[PDB]
Design a protein around this ligand. Structure first.
Ligand SMILES: CCCCCCCC/C=C/CCCCCCCC(=O)OC[C@H](COP(=O)(O)OCCN)OC(=O)CCCCCCCCCCCCCCC
Ligand SMILES: [K+]
Ligand SMILES: [Mg+2]
Lengths: 26, 557, 672, 185
């Protein structure tokens, strides 16, 4: 469904963001 | 029952300890770059001939050497499996494997997983088995031991830049650690009844008329190396329950001791080379406490067993549904925890056949990351990551700076620690979710209810952690599963060994310093408890929903 | 209260998403708030049937939590800006005397010195601060160049030679002097120091970044648990509603720690300002609690400043009593602290009360700068006092002779870190007056204390090597580095920062501004001006390095409070996990409903109470956080034992009973 | 470049090549019977392997456990057990049918049945039942083969191995050689 693919897209990009933030000392 | 079990676990640990101790001394000698007693001219001629004249390696060179050896082995084993209808030693003219199955088998063996989605009796041909799988079972174990050697050296070498010669470590670790011990155990299995011949499949007429065609290849050799290296990839479909592989109870016991021989000894050796044996005892105690709790749980659960048989009519009520008769329900349970926590993968009973708790504990031992006496090499540095994190949080909550064994723990090492410790559950959860979300992966199930979900979960947990065991009901030979699990094993292995070399490189430059007020003794029962808490809480928090929805739901039902 | 409302308005302004992604966990709860509000909207007005009220309730609670956390941050920033304004708010009005016909001129235009440009001519006279950098073209005076070197000896600027470049800010002491503004108001020395401090930015303390790593790690773990928890439950049967899923996400991620971070910060700020030492943030307080090496300034930091007379050193058989009487009666009329100090020293070291009186018929002989010596003529006597060379010239010109042991004593007094004032009565040098610095007041014993704490001690000065060695030894520091221009200060402090050791700093002049700013914890004194106060996080009007020992102790205690509450947050979070899991799992397998431990009313009530407890954790943890727990000295092992025991048991027990009593409230009130 | 390939080739030879060849030579030199499977032989005709186990469904012979292999029971070419969990209705069906069969075929026996005879082994090439299971089906064999219970118990005790330690392996009867010896007598 559209909602499912959009949700997983959001979660995926969010994990990319969190791992980036982790490796940083911003 | 409780008396036959307490005795079984008691004698197990006592014997293992004794063997691990002199072994520990020998591995310590090998990690002081010292040649073993009688092998110092042989070593000179062999290294000169191979062109490995001693010259140290920093962490980048060491890592690249290990990865290069592994990729070369992977290419060779892949192509070997694809073209096994051209290679000799093929009595039953079996054809070459597929591309998906060959890929999964190559990746699995090269990364010490030995995940089996085939049937060895009717797929491999005495040569992929002999020169394809056992060779891998040696090189994979050696690679793991090489990495932890480099890590221990990182801890003992003060303010330097060298980490040893990769090739000399591999050549020493294979030629003088694995081969002789393995050969010894191989002749032992041969004596007990195991098989070792290059004959064609024998023809057998029974006392009645039914026609049996016994498969008969080189089994003792593979058995010895697959257990001593914690590979877990067996010659037959039922990898270790088959009679030709595990014929007598004595052989079963030697298999368990061999399953732990090297990791326990590496804990001892690490405790020796640093000059302080208290450190080694702290480590061993931590792992052994978790181990005893888990064995007690599984034994108790299965001794209760299936309550339905009683009502159907059975005399006794013990879950003896997927367990050989050579051994009892006690040894079957013990071996389940031993292969699950030691990251070996060899099963002596079908794990799908256990009751809900018997399926929850082993799976959960795999998910935490194979740190309880884990895989040879891989397990100890897994529990180094957790020990470093444990001092990181202890110092953080007490309000001092974190220092371990004199070294100073920096934010950089911590970053890498978090990275590695998360790379494993990410694969687990993502893969299991993907499988459950697709009709293909969903169709491989063989059990309704939440147990069906437990199958998929367990499969991916074995793949990501390189355990190699499986619930075995899952028909995972389709290309979907082959590629999925191949990706999981490959990334699990290397994703978790690169940061270890990075942390080793960082700590090799650090210099050890004198005690302070931020130096909390890591030996004693306060760090032992701190560490157990770290591991168990990390694991529980990361997997409670899956576990709740899988085996637990089956249980309460 | 007013500050608190001001902070609330500021926090709601800070809602702006562009600023939300500064912290990770916050932006997480932010996007969660957004998702639940969108679901509540579409469900209530659109194609998604379900209970719109539950979604609106949960969404409001999430929004509320973001508001409270941002409000804590705003309160911290507001208190910091308030104290910054209260401490750095003073009247300022630099003035300069622009001249016409710049030979000498008499048209003094009181033009603000900031408005001066290059080529313009200025007049400065005794006491008036040098308006801006430049050069001298007429008149010779003795400038008080203490903000450049750190020394207090007046230096002669004399309109042509190598002593002709005055500096903006330094005070003039002796007499008139006309200046030629030879720098633009934008390229002055103060602007060089300002450019240096502005170019430097402080970094996060290791103890901060370490906690941050742990938080982001927990974030990843729980995110993956729930995100993947959706399809697992889907397979079995009815999928967990996305609303409960996102609610559980924000209930499980460690949101509480950011608010607790700011709470401990303001806690330390309150305690610190309560210890007569103002700060800029609890960040600086903990950095004070982990100081590894101190960077001190000899002048104006350790010593009170403005050194005055000290000990007398006569020549061969010159009746030291006579020397003291001569010095007393000579420096009588003087008003500068050095003359009064000579008078006090002589008068309290001997009995000469009779002779002091200002009614007697003596022509006071003040300083001239031609002969370069002050004095008096009381009765048939010509008492004079001044530099060694000035009196050498005077004696050699009066047909006398200058003994050599007087010069030996002069060299000695120079080697001891003091300016020697030779005294004469006619044509016979009576001796020397050593103007040593003021006293350290127990700093040697406190440096021994610092050594007991294993904290390095370092000096920074712009004096001669021998003088620096002498004064450093008398201070008790480990080593020294002299002639350290501000660039050398920064060079040393950064080369030491390369090792990773937290550096402490203190100093008063405009020359010490850059070093003060870069250091993670640097205190200041009242002697310094805005250049001092504006650079460096800390401040201490008392100018006593002793307090650094105390403030590292206080920092220790603040770290302990942070650690304990850091245990509370962790325990609370994990307790929320085990207390909420089954209550949420109530849609697919009823057996898991039987697994409930607290026996909450329903899954809706469960999640509601959970997020409620979430916001409650924030607000109700503010007071206990700002209060602070009393610490007693103990060893790391026992410190950990006690920390775990008290805070761990408290936390692990709290969320269970808390959610239970909130469930009692839910049931008896009947919100749903 | 050179050390990678070289050490790879050397290890490949010594492991894949030398090690199994060496172990095989020593095995067939010292323990030849075992290394070739330890078969029962009747001239050219091999009755079977002393370890694998066969599908005895005859009245006079002793019954082991059911196998649940791929093609036909006790098939050594597709070994594997029925991977059936406890929460599967299929297991409750199969066990019910099996216990009905054993109750029927053994009138002179207890109403209870050793759980072992009912449930399938792990490999399917199981040739081991505890002496109790063998004991429970004594009177059938005696009554069928016109033997005596005394000597039949002697047989069951004569083809039953023990482990050294008493708490690692259970006492085990060997069914293949037992049926052979039975028919000999
Ligand atoms: C939120 C946590 C919640 C924390 C709640 C648990 C804390 C309770 C522990 C205090 C002991 C209380 C009385 C202790 C006093 C009585 C003495 C006694 O009875 O012996 C027992 C000795 C004490 O003595 P000791 O240490 O050896 O003292 C000299 C050496 N230090 O504890 C031992 O052996 C080992 C057992 C200690 C328990 C620690 C292991 C679990 C840690 C859980 C936290 C994991 C970290 C989280 C990571 C995410
Ligand atoms: K394995
Ligand atoms: Mg100064």
């Amino acid at each position: 469904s559209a909602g499912v693919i959009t949700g997983v897209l959001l979660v995926f990009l969010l994990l990319g963001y969190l791992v980036y933030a982790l490796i940083n000392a911003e | 029952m409780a008396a036959q079990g307490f005795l079984l676990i008691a004698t197990f640990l006592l014997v293992l300890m004794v063997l691990a101790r002199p072994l520990g001394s020998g591995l310590a000698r090998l990690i002081n770059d010292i040649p073993l007693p009688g092998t110092t001219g042989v070593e000179r001629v062999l290294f000169r001939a191979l062109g490995v004249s001693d010259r140290e390696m920093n962490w980048k060179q060491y890592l690249c050497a290990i990865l290069g050896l592994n990729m070369l082995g992977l290419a060779v084993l892949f192509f070997m499996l694809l073209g096994q209808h051209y290679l000799p030693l093929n009595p039953q003219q079996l054809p070459g494997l597929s591309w998906d199955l060959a890929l999964n088998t190559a990746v699995s063996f090269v990364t010490n997983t030995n995940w089996r989605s085939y049937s060895g009796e009717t797929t491999l041909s005495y040569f992929s088995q002999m020169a394809g799988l056992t060779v891998q079972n040696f090189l994979s174990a050696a690679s793991g031991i090489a990495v932890i050697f480099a890590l221990i050296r990182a801890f003992t070498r003060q303010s330097m830049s060298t980490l040893g010669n990769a090739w000399v470590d591999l050549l020493r670790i294979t030629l003088w650690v694995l081969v002789p011990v393995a050969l010894l155990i191989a002749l032992f299995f041969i004596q007990q009844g195991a098989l070792q011949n290059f004959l064609p499949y024998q023809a057998v007429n029974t006392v009645e008329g039914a026609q049996q065609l016994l498969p008969m290849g080189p089994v003792a050799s593979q058995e010895a190396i697959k257990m001593l290296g914690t590979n877990g990839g067996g010659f037959f479909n039922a990898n270790s329950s088959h009679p030709f592989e595990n014929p007598t109870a004595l052989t079963n016991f030697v298999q368990m001791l061999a399953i732990f021989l090297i990791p326990t000894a590496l804990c001892f050796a690490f405790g020796e080379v640093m000059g302080d044996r208290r450190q080694g005892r702290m480590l061993l105690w931590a792992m052994s406490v978790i181990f005893v709790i888990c064995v007690g749980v599984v034994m108790w659960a299965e001794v209760q067993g299936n309550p339905h048989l009683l009502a159907l009519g059975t005399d006794s009520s013990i879950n003896m549904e997927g367990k050989e008769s050579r051994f009892g329900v006690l040894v079957s349970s013990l071996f389940a925890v031993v292969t699950t926590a030691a990251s070996c993968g060899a099963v002596i009973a079908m794990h799908d056949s256990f009751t809900a708790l018997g399926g929850m504990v082993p799976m959960w031992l795999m998910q935490i990351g194979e740190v309880v006496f884990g895989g040879v090499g891989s397990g100890l540095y897994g529990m180094m990551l957790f020990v470093l994190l444990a001092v990181f949080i202890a110092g953080l909550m007490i309000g001092r700076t974190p220092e371990y064994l004199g070294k100073k723990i920096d934010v950089r090492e911590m970053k890498l620690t978090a990275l590695a410790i998360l790379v494993t559950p990410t694969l687990v959860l993502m893969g299991a979710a993907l499988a459950m979300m697709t009709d293909a992966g969903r169709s491989a199930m063989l059990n309704p209810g939440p147990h069906g979900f437990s199958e998929v979960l367990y499969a991916v947990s074995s793949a990501a952690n390189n355990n190699g065991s499986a619930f075995a009901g899952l028909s995972a030979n389709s290309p979907f599963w082959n590629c999925l699990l191949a990706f999981c094993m490959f990334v699990g292995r290397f994703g978790v060994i690169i940061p270890v070399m990075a942390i080793a490189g960082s700590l090799v430059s650090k210099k050890s310093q004198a005690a302070s007020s931020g130096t909390l003794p890591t030996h004693g029962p306060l760090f032992v408890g701190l560490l157990i808490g770290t591991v168990l809480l990390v694991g529980a928090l990361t997997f409670i929903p899956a576990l709740a929805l899988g085996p637990v739901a089956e249980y309460l039902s | 209260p007013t500050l608190v409302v001001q902070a609330l308005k500021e926090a709601v302004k800070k809602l702006n998403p562009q600023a939300q992604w500064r912290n990770p966990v916050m932006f997480i709860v932010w996007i969660g708030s957004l998702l639940t509000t969108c679901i509540s909207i579409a469900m209530a007005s659109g194609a998604m049937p379900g209970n719109a009220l539950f979604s609106a309730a949960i969404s409001g609670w999430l929004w509320i939590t973001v508001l409270f956390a941002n409000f804590a941050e705003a309160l911290a920033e507001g208190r910091s800006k308030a104290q910054a304004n209260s401490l750095k708010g003073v009247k300022k009005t630099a003035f300069a005397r622009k001249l016409r016909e710049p030979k000498y001129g008499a048209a003094a235009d009181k033009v603000p010195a900031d408005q001066l440009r290059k080529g313009d001519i200025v007049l400065v006279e005794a006491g008036d601060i040098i308006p801006c950098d430049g050069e001298v073209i007429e008149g010779g005076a003795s400038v008080d160049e203490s903000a450049i070197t750190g020394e207090a000896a007046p230096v002669i600027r004399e309109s042509g030679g190598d002593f002709a470049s005055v500096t903006g800010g330094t005070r003039i002491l002796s007499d008139w002097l006309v200046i030629e503004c030879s720098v633009n108001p934008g390229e002055t020395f103060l602007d060089r120091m300002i450019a240096m401090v502005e170019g430097a930015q402080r970094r996060k303390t290791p103890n901060e970044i370490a906690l941050t790593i742990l938080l982001i790690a927990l974030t990843i773990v729980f995110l993956l648990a729930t995100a993947t928890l959706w399809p697992f439950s889907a397979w079995g049967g009815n999928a967990v509603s996305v609303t409960v899923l996102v609610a559980l996400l924000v209930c499980l991620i460690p949101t509480t720690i950011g608010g607790l971070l700011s709470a401990i910060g303001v806690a330390g700020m309150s305690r610190m300002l309560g210890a007569n030492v103002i700060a800029t943030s609890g960040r600086a307080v903990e950095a004070a609690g982990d100081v590894d090496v101190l960077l001190l300034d000899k002048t104006g930091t350790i010593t009170l400043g403005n050194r005055q007379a000290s000990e007398f050193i006569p020549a061969q058989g010159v009746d030291e009593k006579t020397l003291a009487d001569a010095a007393q009666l000579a420096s009588l009329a003087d008003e500068t602290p050095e003359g009064r100090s000579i008078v006090i020293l002589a008068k309290q070291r001997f009995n000469l009360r009779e002779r002091d009186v200002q009614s007697l018929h003596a022509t006071f002989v003040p300083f001239t700068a031609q002969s370069r010596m002050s004095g008096i003529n009381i009765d048939n006597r010509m008492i004079r006092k001044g530099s060694v060379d000035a009196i050498r010239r005077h004696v050699e010109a009066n047909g006398g002779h200058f003994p050599t042991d007087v010069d030996q004593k002069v060299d000695q007094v120079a080697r001891q870190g003091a300016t020697p004032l030779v005294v004469v009565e006619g044509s016979r040098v009576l001796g020397v007056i050593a103007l040593k610095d003021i006293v350290k007041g127990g700093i040697k014993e406190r440096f021994a204390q610092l050594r007991k704490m294993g904290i390095k001690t370092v000096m920074i000065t712009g004096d001669n090597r021998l003088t620096a060695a002498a004064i450093a030894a008398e201070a008790g520091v480990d080593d020294f580095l002299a002639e350290a221009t501000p660039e050398a200060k920064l060079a040393l402090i950064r080369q030491y920062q390369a090792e990773g050791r937290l550096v402490a700093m203190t100093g008063d002049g405009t020359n010490d501004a850059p070093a003060l700013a870069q250091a993670d914890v640097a205190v200041a004194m009242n002697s310094g001006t805005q250049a001092a106060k504006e650079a460096g996080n800390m401040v201490d009007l008392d100018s006593n390095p002793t307090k650094l020992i105390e403030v590292v102790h206080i920092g220790k205690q603040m770290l302990m409070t942070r650690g304990s509450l850091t245990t509370f947050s962790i325990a609370n979070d994990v307790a929320k996990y085990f207390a909420i899991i089954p209550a949420a799992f109530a849609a697919t397998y009823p057996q898991l409903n039987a697994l409930n431990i607290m026996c909450l009313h329903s899954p809706d009530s469960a999640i509601l109470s959970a997020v409620i407890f979430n916001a409650l954790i924030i607000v109700f943890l503010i007071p206990l956080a700002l209060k602070g727990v009393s610490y007693k000295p103990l060893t790391a092992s026992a410190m950990l034992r006690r920390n775990l025991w008290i805070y761990g048991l408290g936390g692990l027990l709290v969320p269970f009973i808390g959610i239970k009593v909130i469930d009692l409230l839910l049931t008896v009130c009947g919100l749903v | 470049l050179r050390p990678a390939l070289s050490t790879f080739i050397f290890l490949l030879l010594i492991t894949g090549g030398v090690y199994p060849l060496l172990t095989t030579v020593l095995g067939q030199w010292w323990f030849p019977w075992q290394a070739n499977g330890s078969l029962i032989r009747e001239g050219d005709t091999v009755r079977g392997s002393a370890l694998i186990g066969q599908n005895f469904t005859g009245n006079g012979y002793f019954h082991g456990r059911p196998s649940a292999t791929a093609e036909m029971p006790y098939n050594p070419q597709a070994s594997g057990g029925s991977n059936l969990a406890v929460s599967n209705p299929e297991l409750d069906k199969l066990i019910a049918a099996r216990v009905a069969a054993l109750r029927a075929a053994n009138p002179d026996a207890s109403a209870s049945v050793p759980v072992e005879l009912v449930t399938a082994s792990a490999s399917g090439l199981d040739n081991n039942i505890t002496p109790q299971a063998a004991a429970w089906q004594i009177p059938r064999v005696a009554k069928a083969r016109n033997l005596s219970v005394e000597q039949l118990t002697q047989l069951i005790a004569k083809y039953s191995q023990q482990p050294l330690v008493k708490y690692i392996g259970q006492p085990v009867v060997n069914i293949v050689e037992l049926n052979l010896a039975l028919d000999k007598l």
